[PDB]
Design a protein around this ligand. Structure first.
Ligand SMILES: *[C@@H]1O[C@H](CO)[C@@H](O[C@@H]2O[C@H](CO)[C@@H](O[C@H]3O[C@H](CO)[C@@H](O)[C@H](O)[C@@H]3O)[C@H](O)[C@H]2NC(C)=O)[C@H](O)[C@H]1NC(C)=O
Ligand SMILES: *[C@@H]1O[C@H](CO)[C@@H](O[C@@H]2O[C@H](CO)[C@@H](O[C@H]3O[C@H](CO)[C@@H](O)[C@H](O)[C@@H]3O)[C@H](O)[C@H]2NC(C)=O)[C@H](O)[C@H]1NC(C)=O
Ligand SMILES: *[C@@H]1O[C@H](CO)[C@@H](O[C@@H]2O[C@H](CO)[C@@H](O[C@H]3O[C@H](CO)[C@@H](O)[C@H](O)[C@@H]3O)[C@H](O)[C@H]2NC(C)=O)[C@H](O)[C@H]1NC(C)=O
Ligand SMILES: *[C@@H]1O[C@H](CO)[C@@H](O[C@@H]2O[C@H](CO)[C@@H](O[C@H]3O[C@H](CO)[C@@H](O)[C@H](O)[C@@H]3O)[C@H](O)[C@H]2NC(C)=O)[C@H](O)[C@H]1NC(C)=O
Ligand SMILES: *[C@@H]1O[C@H](CO)[C@@H](O[C@@H]2O[C@H](CO)[C@@H](O[C@H]3O[C@H](CO)[C@@H](O)[C@H](O)[C@@H]3O)[C@H](O)[C@H]2NC(C)=O)[C@H](O)[C@H]1NC(C)=O
Ligand SMILES: *[C@@H]1O[C@H](CO)[C@@H](O[C@@H]2O[C@H](CO)[C@@H](O[C@H]3O[C@H](CO)[C@@H](O)[C@H](O)[C@@H]3O)[C@H](O)[C@H]2NC(C)=O)[C@H](O)[C@H]1NC(C)=O
Ligand SMILES: *[C@@H]1O[C@H](CO[C@@H]2O[C@@H](C)[C@@H](O)[C@@H](O)[C@@H]2O)[C@@H](O[C@@H]2O[C@H](CO)[C@@H](O)[C@H](O)[C@H]2NC(C)=O)[C@H](O)[C@H]1NC(C)=O
Ligand SMILES: *[C@@H]1O[C@H](CO)[C@@H](O)[C@H](O)[C@H]1NC(C)=O
Ligand SMILES: *[C@@H]1O[C@H](CO)[C@@H](O)[C@H](O)[C@H]1NC(C)=O
Ligand SMILES: *[C@@H]1O[C@H](CO)[C@@H](O)[C@H](O)[C@H]1NC(C)=O
Lengths: 42, 240, 339, 47
C-alpha cells in the first residue's frame, strides 16, 4: 500500500563530487560528444 | 561527427514535440500582454465612488450640476488605470529591449561568428549556432563540442634531456606509466617527444617536478642514414 | 545580485481591521491585486537572479584533503569546517561589512511584545502589513555553491565549465593561463616560487583592505539602505492627512457617522493607495536595475570564473589569468587575478 | 634563427627594414658532418 501526498524537504544543490586532484595527475578526454541545445529569447 | 550532430538535432524535434512547457519564456510575454489588457478592461467596472460605473446611468439619471461631480470620479479613476497600464508597459518594454539587445548580440557573436565566450553560446566549447524564429522571439540551436571518455595520465611541466629543459610547443606532456608523449590539451592523441613537439629554455634545476626522458631529433637518424651512405662509399672506395 | 523580497497586504496597509473602510476599497476594484501581483513578480525574480549567478555548476565539487596547489595559498578563500556556516575567511569579512536591516527570518512576537516595539521600526513596518520574505537559497547554500565553483576552478581550471571536471596540477593550469595571455609558459615555471609569493601577498592585501574600510562595499549596503528607506517612507505616509480631518481611521469612525465619515475615508484610501502605486513603481524600477546587475554578475561568473577572458578590463584590470567568486549579502565579490 | 622567423619578399618593399645575420641551426651540425667526412677522406689516403 502506498499513496501520493505533500512532502517538504531541504533542497539539494547538486550531486556531491570530489575531484581526484594530485600534483602530477592530469585527466584528458579520449573522445568527444557533439550536442545541440535550444536557447529561447523574447 | 556527422552522426552525432544528426542524432543530436533529432532530439530537438522530441524536446519540442513531447513537452508543453518548452517555450514558457515566450508564452509569458503573450500571457502578460493579455492579462494586462484583460485587467484594464475589468477596471471599467470599478465605481471609484460614483453611484454607477456605467457612464450612461449617470447621464440618464442626473442633470449637469451633479452629473459632472459623479463623472469626474470615473474620469479620475479611469485615467489612473491608464496611467498604471502605460507605466507597467513602459517598464516591461524596457526589459524586452534588453532581451532584444542580448538576442542581437547572440546573433552577431554565435551565428555570424564563433565565440570564445564561456557558456555564452550554450554549454561546451562552441562550434556554431543556427537561428530559428518563434512568435515574439528567437530560438538559437547552439552546437558545442563537449569532451568525453577521459583517462587518468601522469604528467610533468617539462622534460629534461641534454641537461636542458624542454616544454610543449602546443599541448601537454603525459605518461601512460612507462612512456612519455606530447598530446594536444583537449583530445588524447599522443606523439613521441621531439625537437619539433617542444621548445627549450634553461637547465633542469629551475623547474619544479621536471622529469627525465629522451627527446627524439627528426634530423639525426636521417643524417645517420646519410653517414651510413658516406661510410659504404668509403669502404667500397678501398677497391679502385 | 538581488534586493529584499518585500510583500504588502493592501487592506492592512490602507486600513487594517476596519470593515467600514474595507467596503470602500472595493470601489477601486483590482488596484490592490495588481500591486500584490507586481511585488510577487519582483519577489519571485530575486531567487531567479540568485540561481542564475551562483547555480552555474552541475555538481558540488570538494577540494582534496591535501591543500597544496603548487605553492599558491587559497587558505583564506576556501571554506573552513570550524565555523557554523561553512563560509571562507574573506566571505566572513564581507558578511560583516554589510549590515542587514531585516534578514526576513521568523519573528516569534516575543520581540514585538514590550519595549523593543517602541525602539524598533522593523516591528512597526510588520504591524502595517509590510513584510520582508526570506530568499530561497540561504547564506549557507550560496556559500556552498561558491565553494563548488571555487573547488572546481583550482582543481580543474575551465574544464568543469565545458564538460566534466578534469584534474590538472595547479602550476600547469596557471601555465596554460600564461600561454592564454601570450606569455610563453616557460616564464611561469622559471618564476613559479615568485609568482606564488606575489599571489599570496596580493590575497593578504585584500583581507587587510576589507578589515580596514567599510566604504568599498557601498554597492551592496546602498541596496539594503534603499529598501529600508522605501519601507520607512511608506510607513511614514500613514501619518499624512491628504485633506481629511485626521490621519487615523479609529478617530474618523469614533467621531463621525457613515454619511460623512465615508467622505473622509475616501481621501485617506485615495492617498494611501497612491502611496502604494508610487512604492511599487520605485520597486519595479529598482528590480530592473538589479536584474541588469545580476545578468552582468552571471556573465562574469561564466566568462571570468569558468574560463579566461580576452575582454579588456572585463575580468579585473590587466591581462586576465583567473577569478574567484565570494558570496556577500545580496551580492557577489569577484577576486579577479591578473598579470 | 631561421626557426624564430619566416621569409617573405625582398628588402626593397618594406619601410625601415634593417640588415643583420640570420642563423641556421642545420648548418653547424651539417658542417660538423663535413668535418666528419673530411677526417675520413684524409685518413682514407693511408689504406
Ligand atoms: C566515441 O563515442 C562514440 C559514441 O558517442 C562511439 O561510437 C559508437 O561506437 C559503438 C561501438 O564501439 C557503436 O555501438 C554499436 O556497435 C555495433 C553495431 O554497429 C554493435 O555491436 C553494438 O552493440 C552497438 O549497437 C555505436 O553505433 C557508435 N555510435 C556512433 C554515433 O557512431 C565511438 O566508438 C567512440 N570512439 C572512441 C575512439 O572511443
Ligand atoms: C605505453 O605506450 C607505449 C606506446 O604505445 C607502449 O609501448 C609499446 O608496446 C608494444 C607492445 O605492447 C611494443 O610492440 C613491439 O613489440 C616487439 C618488442 O620487441 C617488437 O617486435 C614489435 O615490432 C613492436 O615494436 C612497442 O614497440 C612499444 N612502443 C615503444 C615505443 O616502446 C606501452 O606498452 C604502454 N604502456 C602501458 C603501461 O600501457
Ligand atoms: C635526472 O637525470 C639527471 C641526469 O642523469 C640526474 O642527475 C644526476 O644526479 C646525480 C645525483 O645527484 C649526480 O651525481 C653526482 O652528485 C655529486 C656531485 O654533484 C657527487 O657526490 C656524485 O659522485 C656525482 O658526481 C649526477 O652528476 C647528475 N648528472 C649530471 C649529468 O650531472 C638526476 O638525478 C635524475 N633525476 C631523476 C629524479 O631521475
Ligand atoms: C596561507 O596563508 C595563511 C595566512 O598567512 C597562513 O596561516 C597563518 O600561518 C601562521 C603561521 O603558522 C599563523 O601564525 C600563528 O601560528 C600559531 C597558531 O596557533 C601561533 O602559535 C602563532 O603565535 C601565530 O599567531 C597565522 O595565525 C595563520 N593565519 C591564519 C589566518 O590562519 C597559512 O599557514 C598559509 N599556508 C601555508 C601552506 O603556508
Ligand atoms: C621582479 O620583481 C619582483 C618584485 O615584484 C622581484 O622580487 C623581489 O626581489 C627582491 C630582491 O631583488 C627581494 O628583496 C629581498 O631580497 C633579500 C631577501 O631574500 C634581501 O637582501 C632584501 O633586503 C629583500 O628582503 C624581494 O623579496 C622579492 N619579492 C618577491 C615577492 O619575491 C624580482 O626579483 C624581480 N626580478 C627581476 C629579474 O627583475
Ligand atoms: C643592407 O645591406 C645591403 C647589402 O650589403 C646594402 O645594399 C647595398 O647598398 C649599397 C649602397 O646603396 C650599394 O652600393 C652600390 O651603389 C651604387 C650602385 O647602385 C654605386 O655607386 C656603388 O659604387 C655600389 O656599386 C650595393 O650595391 C647594395 N648591395 C645590394 C646587394 O643591394 C644596404 O645598403 C644595407 N642597408 C643598410 C641600411 O644597412
Ligand atoms: C583517476 O584515478 C582516481 C584514483 O587514483 C588512481 O588509483 C589507481 C586505481 C590508478 O587508476 C592510478 O593511475 C590513479 O592514480 C580515481 O578516483 C577514485 O575513483 C573511484 C571510483 O572509480 C572512487 O571509489 C575513489 O574514492 C576515487 N579516489 C579518489 C582519490 O578520488 C578517478 O575516478 C580516476 N579518473 C578517471 C577519469 O577514471
Ligand atoms: C605535492 O607536493 C608537496 C610538496 O612536495 C607534497 O607535500 C605533497 O605530498 C604533494 N601532493 C600530493 C597529493 O602528494
Ligand atoms: C662500388 O663502387 C663502384 C664504382 O667504383 C660501383 O660500380 C658499385 O655499384 C659500388 N657498390 C657499392 C655497394 O657501393
Ligand atoms: C683511420 O682508419 C682506421 C681503420 O682503417 C682506424 O683504425 C683509425 O683509428 C682511423 N683514424 C682516424 C684519425 O680516423
Amino acid at each position: 500500500v502506498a499513496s501520493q501526498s505533500i512532502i517538504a524537504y531541504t533542497m539539494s544543490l547538486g550531486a556531491e563530487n570530489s575531484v581526484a586532484y594530485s600534483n602530477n595527475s592530469i585527466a584528458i578526454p579520449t573522445n568527444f560528444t557533439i550536442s545541440v541545445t535550444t536557447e529561447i529569447l523574447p | 561527427i556527422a552522426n552525432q550532430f544528426n542524432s543530436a538535432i533529432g532530439k530537438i524535434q522530441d524536446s519540442l514535440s513531447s513537452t508543453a512547457s518548452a517555450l514558457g519564456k515566450l508564452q509569458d510575454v503573450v500571457n502578460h500582454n493579455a492579462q494586462a489588457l484583460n485587467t484594464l478592461v475589468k477596471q471599467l467596472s470599478s465605481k471609484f465612488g460614483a453611484i454607477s460605473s456605467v457612464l450612461n446611468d449617470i447621464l440618464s439619471r442626473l442633470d449637469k450640476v451633479e452629473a459632472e461631480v459623479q463623472i469626474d470620479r470615473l474620469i479620475t479613476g479611469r485615467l489612473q488605470s491608464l496611467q498604471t497600464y502605460v507605466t507597467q508597459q513602459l517598464i516591461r518594454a524596457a526589459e524586452i529591449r534588453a532581451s532584444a539587445n542580448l538576442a542581437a548580440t547572440k546573433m552577431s557573436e554565435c551565428v555570424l561568428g564563433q565565440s570564445k565566450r564561456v557558456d555564452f553560446c550554450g554549454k561546451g566549447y562552441h562550434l556554431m549556432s543556427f537561428p530559428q524564429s518563434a512568435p515574439h522571439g528567437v530560438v538559437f540551436l547552439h552546437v558545442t563540442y563537449v569532451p568525453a571518455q577521459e583517462k587518468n595520465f601522469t604528467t610533468a611541466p617539462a622534460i629534461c634531456h641534454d641537461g636542458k629543459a624542454h616544454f610543449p610547443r602546443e599541448g601537454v606532456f603525459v605518461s601512460n606509466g612507462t612512456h612519455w608523449f606530447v598530446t594536444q590539451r583537449n583530445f588524447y592523441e599522443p606523439q613521441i617527444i621531439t625537437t619539433d613537439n617542444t621548445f627549450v629554455s634553461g637547465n633542469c634545476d629551475v623547474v619544479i617536478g621536471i622529469v627525465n626522458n629522451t627527446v627524439y631529433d627528426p634530423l639525426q637518424p636521417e643524417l645517420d642514414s646519410f653517414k651510413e651512405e658516406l661510410d659504404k662509399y668509403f669502404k667500397n672506395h678501398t677497391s679502385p | 545580485v538581488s534586493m529584499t523580497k518585500t510583500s504588502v497586504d493592501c487592506t492592512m496597509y490602507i486600513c487594517g481591521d476596519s470593515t467600514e473602510c474595507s467596503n470602500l476599497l472595493l470601489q477601486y476594484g483590482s488596484f490592490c491585486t495588481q500591486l500584490k501581483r507586481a511585488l510577487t513578480g519582483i519577489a519571485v525574480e530575486q531567487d531567479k537572479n540568485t540561481q542564475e549567478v551562483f547555480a552555474q555548476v552541475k555538481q558540488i565539487y570538494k577540494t582534496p584533503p591535501i591543500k597544496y596547489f603548487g605553492g599558491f595559498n587559497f587558505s583564506q578563500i576556501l571554506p573552513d569546517p570550524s565555523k557554523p556556516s561553512k563560509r571562507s575567511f574573506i566571505e566572513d569579512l564581507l558578511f560583516n561589512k554589510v549590515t542587514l536591516a531585516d534578514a526576513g527570518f521568523i519573528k516569534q512576537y516575543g520581540d514585538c511584545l514590550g519595549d523593543i516595539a517602541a525602539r524598533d521600526l522593523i516591528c512597526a513596518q510588520k504591524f502595517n502589513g509590510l513584510t520582508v520574505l526570506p530568499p530561497l537559497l540561504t547564506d549557507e547554500m550560496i556559500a556552498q555553491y561558491t565553494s563548488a565553483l571555487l573547488a572546481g576552478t583550482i582543481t580543474s581550471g575551465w574544464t568543469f565549465g565545458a564538460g566534466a571536471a578534469l584534474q590538472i596540477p595547479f602550476a600547469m593550469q596557471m601555465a596554460y593561463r600564461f600561454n592564454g595571455i601570450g606569455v610563453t609558459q616557460n616564464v611561469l615555471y622559471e618564476n613559479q616560487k615568485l609568482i606564488a609569493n606575489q599571489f599570496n601577498s596580493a590575497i593578504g592585501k585584500i583581507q587587510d583592505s576589507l578589515s580596514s574600510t567599510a566604504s568599498a562595499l557601498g554597492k551592496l549596503q546602498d541596496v539594503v539602505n534603499h529598501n529600508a528607506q522605501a519601507l520607512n517612507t511608506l510607513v511614514k505616509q500613514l501619518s499624512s492627512k491628504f485633506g481629511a480631518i485626521s490621519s487615523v481611521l479609529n478617530d474618523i469612525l469614533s467621531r463621525l457617522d457613515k454619511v460623512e465619515a465615508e467622505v473622509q475615508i475616501d481621501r485617506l484610501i485615495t492617498g494611501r493607495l497612491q502611496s502604494l502605486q508610487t512604492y511599487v513603481t520605485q520597486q519595479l524600477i529598482r528590480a530592473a536595475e538589479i536584474r541588469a546587475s545580476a545578468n552582468l554578475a552571471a556573465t562574469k561568473m561564466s566568462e571570468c570564473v569558468l574560463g579566461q577572458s580576452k575582454r579588456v578590463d572585463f575580468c579585473g584590470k590587466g591581462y586576465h589569468l583567473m577569478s574567484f567568486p565570494q558570496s556577500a549579502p545580496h551580492g557577489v565579490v569577484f577576486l579577479h587575478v591578473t598579470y
